[PDB]
Amino acid sequence: MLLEAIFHEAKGSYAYPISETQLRVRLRAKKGDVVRCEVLYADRYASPEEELAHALAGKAGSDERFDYFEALLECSTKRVKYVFLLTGPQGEAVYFGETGFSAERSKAGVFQYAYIHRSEVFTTPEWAKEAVIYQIFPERFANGDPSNDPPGTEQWAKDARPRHDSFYGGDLKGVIDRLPYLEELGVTALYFTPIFASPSHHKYDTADYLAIDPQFGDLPTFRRLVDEAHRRGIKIILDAVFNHAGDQFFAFRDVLQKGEQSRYKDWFFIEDFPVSKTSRTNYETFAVQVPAMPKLRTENPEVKEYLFDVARFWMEQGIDGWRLDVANEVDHAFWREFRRLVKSLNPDALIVGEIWHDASGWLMGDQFDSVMNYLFRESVIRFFATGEIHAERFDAELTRARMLYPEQAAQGLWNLLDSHDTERFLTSCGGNEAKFRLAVLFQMTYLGTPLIYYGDEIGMAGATDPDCKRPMIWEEKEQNRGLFEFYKELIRLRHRLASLTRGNVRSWHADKQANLYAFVRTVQDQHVGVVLNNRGEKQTVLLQVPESGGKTWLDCLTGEEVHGKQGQLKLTLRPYQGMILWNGR
Amino acid sequence: MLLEAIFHEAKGSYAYPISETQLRVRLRAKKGDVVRCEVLYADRYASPEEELAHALAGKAGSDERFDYFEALLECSTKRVKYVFLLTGPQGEAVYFGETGFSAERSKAGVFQYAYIHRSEVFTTPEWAKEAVIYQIFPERFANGDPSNDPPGTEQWAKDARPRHDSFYGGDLKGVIDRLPYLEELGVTALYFTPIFASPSHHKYDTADYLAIDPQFGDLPTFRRLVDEAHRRGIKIILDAVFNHAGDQFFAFRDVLQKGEQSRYKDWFFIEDFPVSKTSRTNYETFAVQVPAMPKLRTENPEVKEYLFDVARFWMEQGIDGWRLDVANEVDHAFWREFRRLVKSLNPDALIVGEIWHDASGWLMGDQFDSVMNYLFRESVIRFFATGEIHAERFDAELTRARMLYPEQAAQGLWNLLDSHDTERFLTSCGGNEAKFRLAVLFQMTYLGTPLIYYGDEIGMAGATDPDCKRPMIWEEKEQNRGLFEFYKELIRLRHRLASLTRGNVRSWHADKQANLYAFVRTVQDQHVGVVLNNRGEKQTVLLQVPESGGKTWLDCLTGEEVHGKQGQLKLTLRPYQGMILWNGR
Ligand SMILES: [Ca+2]
Ligand SMILES: [Ca+2]
């Protein structure tokens, strides 16, 4: 077979513990190029003469080019060596080891997992596992306190069309006054973009990390929100921008004054002195030449201790987690220590970085708990919105990413359909609710934490930034209640069905022609099949269904009881209709 | 080409900064599949309408199945986003990026390397970059103080055939007296095995990590050795065990004598009581059924602190490095923190662990500086000793292991030929000095830190443990001064030719027939073509040498002056003769 395509590494996303005594091993190989992959393992210090323990690695799923096999090494010694046995199509065999490939087991070698220390087991907040985050763009959510509105605030209307310099008054107070709504919907957590003291409209150039920006509120009001939120079963998540600071930050303001005389010169990245200039800057900033944003030297202990203090403060205020802004741009050590600090104060405080590329490095279990799933979104966009890729590609894209990181991460990844940095998904769907809906039914049933962008629940609309930041629609006569209900129910099902939150995924059906995709969520003896007919015509399809997994499901959405007849299950989906079948166990 | 063979990642040994503004990148492929590999890159925040820089990745080498390309990226902004351009035999142009492979650059996405932090540039001590260690098993090296000689010691004779529990009285005072010997040899640091107070013949079950064993010496005696060695250009590298303790350790005692009533019960891995018995373990130990070695719970903040205290002390005595056994069976967080500590007391403290399998997760730069290059020994122990493998294979086994880690790690790897655990290399050669020499020659010109086992520099032969620990031959008469002066001259050269210590490695010639392997060490403009003639015959091979690298070389071993013609170099080598050609630059 093709051995230069087979891959595995006794670490990272291919080898990791799930329990102190259980190791997860994965193997990659060319699609179809392999048919049977078994794992022969035994304690590292065991006699070579002894018999190795066998382990079967099922095909966890495949993508555009690879097949993925996954097993589960049961280890009592907490230490284990293991070699693969790969059987191909024609029936040929080969051993895969650290040493290399060989027909003989000996010359194959053997991979090794040093030791499984409980402290290196990827562990995340249990609640986070089954939760629904809701992104709040404060400025445009709800204006509850007029007295704190910035000068020149445009009236709050539905037919308003926002501009980079527009303002509507959105503030914390408002968030509270609306909690009942947020609760009704079922969100269990709120994600707040930057709400710290800042002079700009974007508030990404922090001025005071220890104070809530005026237009939004104050410590008293925040504490209140937190509590009023907490009692209503909603958690708070604050956006931390530790990478760069604002050109007003006390520490940076001094540098701009005392120059090299300030005990803060090495808190930032400066070169040619003195420190100032028009549109030119001798100090490093966020992105390319952004004066109002001096990169913070998170490597310097001082610069670390401050940020950490900032964490402590707000930690005490009662928040439930952090959303790292531009995290991949800050030394890993900072992050490693940040987690530790955050976790000692609150073991359930979630930590979510924002990287726009293979986040594997921060997702080993010692840094962040998860990252925004830009990939999930892209796949979503091109499959339900633009129709650029067909169900087969959609399956591959989805499958490739799942394998990218350890399950622990995989399962926590924040799946958004959009953001303040992108156009509304409805708009992406060219105004077609049907598509929109199906997309939601998928986000709401797929692997990974659901993130709803404020508005989308009642069908708001809008082009790219800042058109995606229109003010929240509050008039019932002007809201999409039918949608709101659709969400409510999906959100509920996600709580009633455990498979959907704590279950794995495995592709069920894919048709590039019919353009229909289906996956299954499995946990213990349960089971939940999701069928999606991504088309504008009525279609019927036959899906493989062995009695071992049951022969009668229930469309949790319509109540229709579908019955299976000899491994097959006939299904007739309406345009852009989605089915959520529950086996019963 | 087989795209499922190509592999790369923006981390580990495939993406790492050699400096704060330079990112080394490595690409893997099927041997032969790729012919040309170029890297297109620009700042992470660069504009798409902007131009892309270029970097020609040259075939850094090639093992049994893969081809490895390498390219150094110059990033001033410290933010790089790149994409590969591969080209196969048929000139097919395919780009490789984070998204995947495509004949369209854009459609191929692009790899990204977040940010280059100076604190994350694998940094090792300068002195270690060109040192030559000398393993000392204090028991059988020099007995300078008989006042410590344990009752039952034997006679120091050339014919002494040690036994599994023999005694020779060797101690530290002997290491001091005999220093003029080492200095002469040319060594630059000594590596001792466990020398901490312990009740055993191997002392791997430490009793007091705070004092020398009674039979070896004491604090005063130790210091004296340190200062004396230091004023001779020799450094001290102690071997400490932090994975487990001895059964007599002050803490474990309390436990084996106060069940769960022990204020140290969480300092070990205990399942139940009674605490112990012969042939019974109620606690975890190194390997299986080894009561003497009770694993330490390095995860415990207290157990960690103590070990650190042990470090601190011995580091204040003036040591310069640590050699850690079973380093892989102790959590990362420990090592990360241990490195940070040590480095704060002495920026030039070397930290080397012992891992008998891929050690990448420990050689990222935040933990160990290097490991014992066991891959090297095996490849050497078969090419010059037994002859199980031919030159081609050799070349491969090297080129492979080499690529395991980043360049800063591969470069400090301790290349041993034998050790206190194996048989002496001469004995692996069946007493054949001819072969041995070449080996030494290679081991002394190849990439990585040369480690010399006590005695092997004068011929000292011997079978596997405990026959590898024969009493050091001190009677000049009964010594192979011929080898001694051979070793010495080699050391001198490696200290004169930058390339040999701080240079990269690339194969020059590898012929399965003649069985002649020749490699080249390089730095800036210097070159050291080393040619190895591994055959009992006087073979003559041709070497490809473009007039760019030079036209005239010099064999530093003999002084002969060879010349290249029209990009061709004819050399006549003798049976097992080593040549070290310097391009005179
Ligand atoms: Ca307001
Ligand atoms: Ca003695």
B112 contacts in chain A (CB < 8 Å): 356-357
B43, B77, B357 member nearest A112 (Cβ): B357
Distances in Å between the Cα of B85 and the Cα atoms of A146, A515, B92, B350, B475 are: 57, 33, 10, 39, 63
CATH code for the structural domain at A122-242+298-502: 3.20.20.80
Give the distance (Å) from ligand 2 centre to CA of residue B243: 29
A117 contacts in chain B (CB < 8 Å): 298-299, 330-331
- Which amino acid, residue A93? A
Answer yes or no: do A331 and B361 touch at CB < 8 A: no
CATH 3.20.20.80 positions along chain A are: 122-242+298-502
Do strands A449-453 and A133-136 pair parallel, antiparallel, or not at all (unpaired)?
A: parallel
Task: Count how many residues are written for chain B.
Answer: 585
Resolution, given in Å to one decimal, reads: 3.2
Count CB neighbours of A238 within 10 A: 22
Which A residues 118-177 touch B at CB under 8 Å? 118-120
For B243-297, give the CATH class: alpha beta
* Helix runs in A48-142, H state only: 126-129
Tell me the shortest Cα–Cα distance from A303 to chain B, in angstroms: 14
Count CB neighbours of A33 within 10 A: 17
Strand order in the sheet with B552-555: B504-511, B516-523, B526-533, B578-582, B552-555, B561-563
Give the distance (Å) from ligand 2 centre to CA of residue B427: 28
Taken in order A373, A374, A377, A382, the sign of the CA dihedral is negative
Query: How far apart are the C-alpha atoms of A351 and A367, rounded to whole Å?
Result: 8
B79 contacts in chain A (CB < 8 Å): 329
Angle between helix B481-496 and helix B433-443 axes, rounded to 10 deg: 20
A4, A299, A358 member nearest B30 (Cβ): A4
Extract the tokens encoding A420. Answer: 């303040």
- Which amino acid, residue B442? F
Count CB neighbours of B267 within 10 A: 22
DSSP state of A131: -
Please say whether the beta carbons of B20 and B466 come within 8 A.
no
CATH 3.90.400.10 positions along chain B are: 243-297
Q: DSSP for B310-378?
A: HHHHHHHTT--EEEETTGGGS-HHHHHHHHHHHHHH-TT-EEEE--SS--GGG-SSSS-SEEB-HHHHH
Query: How far apart are the C-alpha atoms of B406 and B60, rounded to whole Å?
Result: 13
DSSP state of A307: H
Give the distance (Å) from ligand 2 centre to CA of residue B145: 4
Answer yes or no: do B119 and A331 touch at CB < 8 A: yes
Count CB neighbours of A196 within 10 A: 23
- Residues sharing a CB contact under 8 Å with residue B291, sequence separation 6 or more, in sequence order: B247, B276, B278, B281, B285
Please say whether the beta carbons of B429 and B382 come within 8 A.
no
Helix (H, G, I), strand (E, B) or coil at A543: strand
Please say whether the beta carbons of B371 and B449 come within 8 A.
no
Nearest ligand, CA of residue A471? 1
Query: How far apart are the C-alpha atoms of A547 and A567, rounded to whole Å?
Result: 7
Extract the tokens encoding B237. Answer: 């590298």
Nearest to A212 by CA among A143, A454, A201, A223: A223
Please say whether the beta carbons of B322 and B372 come within 8 A.
no
Count CB neighbours of B148 within 10 A: 20
Please say whether the beta carbons of A79 and A114 come within 8 A.
yes
Do strands A22-30 and A15-19 pair parallel, antiparallel, or not at all (unpaired)?
A: antiparallel
Q: CA of A300: which chain B residue's CA is closest? A: B119
Query: How far apart are the C-alpha atoms of B217 and A68, rounded to whole Å?
Result: 58
Nearest ligand, CA of residue A140? 1
Give the distance (Å) from ligand 1 centre to CA of residue A221: 12
Q: CA of A327: which chain B residue's CA is closest? A: B114
Extract the tokens encoding A92. Answer: 């040929």
Do strands B101-102 and B93-96 pair parallel, antiparallel, or not at all (unpaired)?
A: antiparallel
Q: Residue B348: how many CA atoms within 13 Å on its side-chain side? A: 12
Please say whether the beta carbons of B286 and B299 come within 8 A.
no
Query: How far apart are the C-alpha atoms of A458 and A480, rounded to whole Å?
Result: 5
The CATH architecture that domain B1-121 belongs to is Sandwich (2.60)
Query: How far apart are the C-alpha atoms of A1 and A8, rounded to whole Å?
Result: 16
Extract the tokens encoding A414. Answer: 């924040």
Extract the tokens encoding A327. Answer: 């995290």
Please say whether the beta carbons of A356 and A327 come within 8 A.
no
Euclidean distance between the first and the last CA atom of chain B, given in angstroms as a whole number:
40
- Specify which residues A66 forms β-bridges with: A30
- Specify which residues B552 forms β-bridges with: B563
Query: How far apart are the C-alpha atoms of B535 and B196, rounded to whole Å?
Result: 46
Q: Residue B408: how many CA atoms within 13 Å on its side-chain side? A: 23
Taken in order A563, A566, A568, A572, the sign of the CA dihedral is negative
Which B residues 311-370 touch A at CB under 8 Å? 328-333, 336, 355-358, 360-361, 366
Query: How far apart are the C-alpha atoms of B506 and B447, rounded to whole Å?
Result: 10
Extract the tokens encoding B9. Answer: 């990642």
Of all helices (H) and strands (E), which one includes residue A539? strand A539-545
Nearest ligand, CA of residue A173? 1
Please say whether the beta carbons of B461 and B501 come within 8 A.
no
Give the distance (Å) from ligand 2 centre to CA of residue B565: 61
Nearest to A132 by CA among A189, A74, A194: A189
Tell me the shortest Cα–Cα distance from B393 to chain A, in angstroms: 13
DSSP state of A121: S
Query: How far apart are the C-alpha atoms of A378 and A374, rounded to whole Å?
Result: 6
Q: Which of B357, B389, B393, B404 to mutate to test the interface with A (most CBs of A within 10 A)?
A: B357
CA angle A352, A358, A362 (to 5 degrees): 45
Long-range contact list for B496-501, CB < 8 A, 24+ apart? B497/B521, B497/B526, B497/B528, B497/B556, B497/B582, B498/B523, B498/B524, B498/B526, B499/B523, B499/B526, B499/B527, B499/B528, B500/B445, B500/B528, B501/B129, B501/B130
Of all helices (H) and strands (E), which one includes residue A398? helix A391-404
Task: Tell whether B111 is within 8 A of chain A (Cβ).
Answer: yes
Query: How far apart are the C-alpha atoms of B124 and A290, rounded to whole Å?
Result: 35
Task: Tell whether A38 is within 8 A of chain B (Cβ).
Answer: no
- Residues sharing a CB contact under 8 Å with residue B55, sequence separation 6 or more, in sequence order: B25, B38, B39, B41, B71, B72, B73, B74
CATH 2.60.40.10 positions along chain B are: 1-121
Task: Count how many residues are written for chain A.
Answer: 585
Is residue A275 packed enough to be buried (19+ CB in 10 Å), middle (13-18) or exposed (0-12)?
Answer: buried
Query: How far apart are the C-alpha atoms of B98 and B6, rounded to whole Å?
Result: 12
Which A residues 428-487 touch B at CB under 8 Å? none
Name the experimental technique. X-ray
- List the catalytic residues of A: 325, 354
CATH 2.60.40.1180 positions along chain A are: 503-585
Answer yes or no: do B329 and A358 touch at CB < 8 A: no
Give the distance (Å) from ligand 2 centre to CA of residue B352: 29
Answer yes or no: do A115 and B330 touch at CB < 8 A: yes
- Specify which residues B285 forms β-bridges with: B294
Phi, then psi, of A526 in degrees rounded to 5: -75, 180
Please give the CATH superfamily to which domain A503-585 belongs: Golgi alpha-mannosidase II (2.60.40.1180)
Query: How far apart are the C-alpha atoms of A230 and A203, rounded to whole Å?
Result: 25
Radius of gyration, CA atoms only, chain A? 26
